[PDB]
Amino acid sequence: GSSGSSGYCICNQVSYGEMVGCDNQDCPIEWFHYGCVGLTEAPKGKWYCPQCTAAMKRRGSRHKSGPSSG
Ligand SMILES: [Zn+2]
Ligand SMILES: [Zn+2]
Numbered sequence: 748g749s750s751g752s753s754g755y756c757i758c759n760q761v762s763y764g765e766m767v768g769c770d771n772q773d774c775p776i777e778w779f780h781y782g783c784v785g786l787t788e789a790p791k792g793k794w795y796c797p798q799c800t801a802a803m804k805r806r807g808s809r810h811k812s813g814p815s816s817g
Contacts, residue, residue: 756780757798765789769796 755762755778756802767786768776776805779796781787786806795803 756783757796758783767794767796769794769799771795771799774799 752759752761754760755776756766757779757805763780765781766778767781767784767790769779770779772790774796776796784797788814
């Protein structure tokens, strides 16, 4: 059993250093490192973690989620 860190960022590490809270409160992390996501500096506009933008993108165009059979 590995205990100690709260595992937040995608790297499964504690929430330290300059972190950017995902705009989507629903986000399971809502906290990613700047070096992990690549943010030399705070985002002027709205910033969405790579975990959401990936999901939202699929839901957008080609929104076809039917029954899995075959
Ligand atoms: Zn990280
Ligand atoms: Zn997110």
